[PDB]
From a paper:
To develop an understanding of the structural basis of nanobody binding affinity, we carried out the biophysical and structural characterization of a series of six nanobodies targeting the receptor binding domain (RBD) of SARS-CoV-2 spike protein, comprising a hit from screening a naïve nanobody library and five affinity-matured mutants derived from this parental binder; two of the mutants have been shown to be potently neutralize the virus. As a result of binding to this epitope, the nanobody directly competes with the binding of angiotensin-converting enzyme 2 (ACE2) and thus is neutralizing.
Based on cryo-EM data and a computational approach, we then engineered a hybrid nanobody with a CDR3 sequence that improved the binding affinity to the spike protein. We determined the EM structure of the hybrid molecule with the spike. In contrast to the other structures which show a single one-up–two-down arrangement of the spike, the hybrid molecule is found in both one-up–two-down (80%) and two-up–one-down arrangements (20%). We take this observation to indicate that in solution the arrangement of one of the RBD is dynamic, consistent with the decreased entropic binding penalty. The data showed that although the enthalpy of binding to spike was reduced, the entropic penalty was also reduced, confirming the prediction from computational analysis.
Author numbering:
A (entry chain C): 728 to 827, 856 to 1067
B (entry chain A): 922 to 1147
C (entry chain A): 535 to 620, 641 to 676, 689 to 727
């Protein structure tokens, strides 16, 4: 997971919907409204920042040539499908398909297509230039020789690769096929992402549900109190409702802050992986999959990213 | 050349920091946040929270205990809630800062006290070294890195054939400008003559793909006939 | 119908827009509910046709501005609404007023959303545009070509923590 939903809430409208009697009472509580709005704004900005940090790791938008002569290696299942409406790969489509009162939802600064463009750029760089495009200028190199470097990087001589080129390519392609199969049948693979969504959804429903409560007042409806009791009694009941709803908003905001901290941790990890793993070849054990790391390929996903770690 | 480049870069750092302040946003932001969290807090003293006044002595100087108690209960509830909010926000912010600080310590270890092979952990490029500099409530690393600049196209080949056998480079890659073949280190064009001292043998030429033909010079043979 | 009104039905009140619905209430069902125990539809007590209640259009009002040190000229963003309810530009974020729509793409200065950013540029005025991810490039990949550096530079980058 990388990002959350950029939710925002009008505390005033949530507590005192279309009521003046209520709003004048709410003014007595000070800046509570403003600081809640401020916190949520902070969260939304953080989400955008997370996405930027993860994907926008590359200076230029590299693109692959029409020829796919990568020494026998097949990347059609991860490279963009130009026929499709979005510039997204087969696997990216699978991932996108395996995920499902004063409240507003702000849209993200980068759209699925921009994320896909970033991933395509990173992928093309990793393919045509290896790791040189992270250091600086992308320097072309045959894929086989790139893999020879990646072999020398794990204490295996490069003759092994050339002498076993066909086998290596076949193994790689078969593994990619297996990835397709795994993602197609079992959705549970993307739990980490789905979970996130659910949480937020819950946190919203709950919030909304907390409007239907009396909090020790005569009723949940503001208009009923206004129209039935006289002001001196009505004010007390409205105070009860306002206390309850304000407390509910505070709870929601606090939970969202904590959840945002968790997501930011995840996003920082993702950025670190895209740097040490995609843009390079990591010697940190079990940081880039169980095995001797060769390389990694990114794929976007709803509010998150996916690494395919190729290991020896 | 290297020394001059380094010194010029340091000069550029001076200029960048002197011209614009926005560079230190990460620090300033922090300050601002805290300031707000305090101002807000203070502001919440001026509120009534349903009471007849936002002042305590005024209530004490107007009402008897039986009713001053109620008003003071209202004020206390409000102010206690405000304090709880402040403390919670501060705890979360402190967690954030602690994460940042742990990162900074990791950088001072892997980057200053050493030379990291982690990518983009210690600046855009191949990490050479780093130098720390203090700053209010934070630290600033100057990462010195090696960035290849001038690049040239060359024909290449994963190996060559000399006597049916296949020669691979020990440290580097085979290249050709169009006429002659060489072997050179990948990170810098330093072409050398292809020999048995620069290469090692494995198998033959009926396996490798993209293999080519050229002559490998053996330094030993001329020494003998000489 | 089709207007923001303050409605009062048999036992309930609210503010919203009443529209002809496609729902199928039972003969005894009067007012519909959402997932979040929210009233979404009603049955008119006099005429037995069903009406959907849509909340009256609302949303944030944000100001886009360069530094006052530069200019006092600004733009306005009405969030998640339509320009109808209000040099105009409709976006996934809402209605943008005071900023010129431009085909040219630049790097983002002031983010708005859904790939739209804005900035103050040359005579001078505020402009909105789809932001540029970067300069497009193609690498000359061939199975027998390699680029090797003949030179280098020493870069000094500042990281503040
Ligand atoms: C790689 O394997 C894939 C299996 O998906 C094949 O790619 C197909 O290529 C054919 C033409 O060769 C196209 O009609 C299909 O649209 C492609 N399928 C997809 C979904 O990409 C092919 O066997 C290999 N392709 C490459 C580039 O090597
Ligand atoms: C090394 O193990 C691999 C298993 O991955 C073997 O490669 C297989 O070769 C058989 C026939 O020799 C083919 O049917 C398979 O398609 C290959 N496997 C894959 C997944 O491509 C290989 O034979 C083994 N080599 C040694 C030394 O026995
Ligand atoms: C390698 O690149 C560097 C950086 O451009 C070159 O060093 C500069 O050379 C120019 C003119 O030759 C001088 O004006 C600068 O003073 C040098 N840079 C610094 C700050 O030292 C160098 O000439 C290049 N070498 C090659 C092979 O062309
Ligand atoms: C490719 O680089 C080398 C530079 O060393 C050139 O190869 C030389 O060719 C000349 C002319 O026949 C010989 O006398 C030298 O012995 C060769 N040098 C070595 C050490 O191989 C070659 O000319 C260059 N090609 C081009 C197009 O400039
Ligand atoms: C290196 O030279 C050998 C020797 O000529 C080449 O081997 C010939 O390959 C052709 C087709 O490629 C065959 O028709 C001949 O029978 C081969 N000759 C012999 C006697 O082996 C080889 O192609 C060359 N390799 C490269 C890299 O060009
Ligand atoms: C009450 O008077 C209204 C006013 O016309 C009538 O509304 C009808 O409602 C019935 C069912 O509620 C519908 O089948 C008719 O189409 C409505 N007629 C019109 C012209 O609106 C109706 O006479 C009375 N409704 C009831 C409850 O009997
Ligand atoms: C290599 O030649 C290609 C022609 O396709 C060109 O795009 C590239 O800039 C050249 N690289 C260098 C700078 O040697
Ligand atoms: C390199 O590619 C060209 C065209 O794609 C092809 O004719 C040639 O056989 C390839 N060489 C190798 C290394 O197989
Ligand atoms: C306004 O911008 C100018 C141009 O950079 C600068 O010199 C000046 O310090 C700025 N003034 C303020 C109010 O910061
Ligand atoms: C905005 O209004 C126009 C015309 O009033 C209408 O065609 C369009 O469907 C509306 N768009 C949205 C976002 O509802
Ligand atoms: C953008 O291009 C479209 C398509 O031709 C054109 O109708 C429109 O006038 C252009 N807008 C601007 C800002 O030039």
């Amino acid at each position: 997971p990388v990002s959350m939903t950029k939710t925002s809430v009008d505390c005033t409208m949530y507590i005192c919907g279309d009521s003046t009697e209520c709003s004048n009472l709410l003014l007595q509580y000070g800046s509570f409204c403003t600081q809640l709005n401020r916190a949520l704004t902070g969260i939304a900005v953080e989400q955008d920042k997370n996405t930027q940090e993860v994907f926008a790791q590359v200076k230029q938008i590299y693109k692959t040539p029409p020829i796919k002569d990568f020494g026998g290696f097949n990347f059609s299942q991860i490279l963009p499908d130009p026929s499709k409406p979005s510039k997204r790969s087969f696997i990216e489509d699978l991932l996108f398909n395996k995920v499902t009162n004063g409240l507003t939802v702000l849209p993200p600064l980068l759209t699925d297509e921009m994320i896909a463009q970033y991933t395509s750029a990173l992928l093309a760089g990793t393919i045509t230039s290896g790791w040189t495009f992270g250091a600086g200028a992308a320097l072309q190199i045959p894929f086989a020789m790139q893999m020879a470097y990646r072999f020398n990087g794990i204490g295996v001589t490069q003759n092994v690769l050339y002498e076993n080129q066909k086998l290596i390519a076949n193994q790689f392609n078969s593994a990619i096929g297996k990835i397709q199969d795994s993602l197609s049948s079992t959705a549970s693979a993307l739990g980490k992402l789905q979970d996130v969504v659910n949480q937020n959804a819950q946190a919203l429903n709950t919030l909304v549900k907390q409007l239907s409560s009396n909090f020790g007042a005569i009723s949940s409806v503001l208009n009923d109190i206004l129209s039935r009791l006289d002001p001196p009694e009505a004010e007390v009941q409205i105070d009860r409702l306002i206390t309850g709803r304000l407390q509910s908003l505070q709870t929601y905001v606090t939970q969202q802050l904590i959840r945002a901290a968790e997501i930011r941790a995840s996003a920082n990890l993702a950025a670190t992986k895209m740097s040490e793993c995609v843009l390079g070849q990591s010697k940190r054990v079990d940081f880039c999959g169980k095995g001797y790391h060769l390389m990694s390929f990114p794929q976007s996903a709803p509010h998150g990213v996916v690494f395919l770690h190729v290991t020896y | 050349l290297i020394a001059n480049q380094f010194n010029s870069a340091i000069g550029k750092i001076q200029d960048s920091l002197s011209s614009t302040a926005s560079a230190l946003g990460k620090l300033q932001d922090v300050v601002n946040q805290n300031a707000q969290a305090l101002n807000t807090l203070v502001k919440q003293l001026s509120s009534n929270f349903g009471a007849i006044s936002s002042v305590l002595n005024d209530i004490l100087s107007r009402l008897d205990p039986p009713e001053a108690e109620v008003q003071i209960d209202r004020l206390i509830t409000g102010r206690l809630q405000s304090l709880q909010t402040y403390v919670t926000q501060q705890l979360i912010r402190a967690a954030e800062i602690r994460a940042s600080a742990n990162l900074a310590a990791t950088k001072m270890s892997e980057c200053v006290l050493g030379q990291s092979k982690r990518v983009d952990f210690c600046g855009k490029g191949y990490h050479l070294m780093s130098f720390p500099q203090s700053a209010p409530h934070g630290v600033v690393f100057l990462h010195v890195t090696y960035v290849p600049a001038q690049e040239k196209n060359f024909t290449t080949a994963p190996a060559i054939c000399h006597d049916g056998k296949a020669h691979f480079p020990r440290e580097g890659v085979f290249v050709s400008n169009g006429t002659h073949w060489f072997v050179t280190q990948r990170n810098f064009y330093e072409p050398q003559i292809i020999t048995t001292d620069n290469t090692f043998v494995s198998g033959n030429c009926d396996v490798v793909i993209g293999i080519v033909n050229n002559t490998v010079y053996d330094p030993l043979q001329p020494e003998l006939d000489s | 119908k089709n207007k923001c009104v303050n409605f009062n039905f048999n036992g309930l009140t609210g503010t919203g827009v009443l529209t002809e619905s496609n729902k199928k209430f039972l003969p005894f069902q009067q007012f519909g509910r959402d997932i979040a125990d929210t009233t979404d539809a009603v049955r008119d007590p006099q005429t037995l046709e069903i009406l959907d209640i849509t909340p009256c259009s609302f949303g944030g009002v944000s100001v886009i501005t360069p530094g006052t040190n530069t200019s006092n000229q600004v733009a306005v963003l009405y969030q998640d609404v339509n320009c109808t309810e209000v040099n105009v530009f409709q976006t996934r974020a809402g209605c943008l007023i005071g900023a010129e729509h431009v085909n040219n793409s630049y790097e983002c200065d002031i983010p708005i959303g859904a790939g739209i950013c804005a900035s103050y540029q040359t005579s001078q005025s505020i402009i909105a545009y789809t932001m540029s991810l970067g300069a497009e490039n193609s690498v000359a990949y061939s199975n027998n070509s390699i680029a090797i550096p003949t030179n280098f530079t020493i870069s000094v980058t500042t990281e503040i923590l």
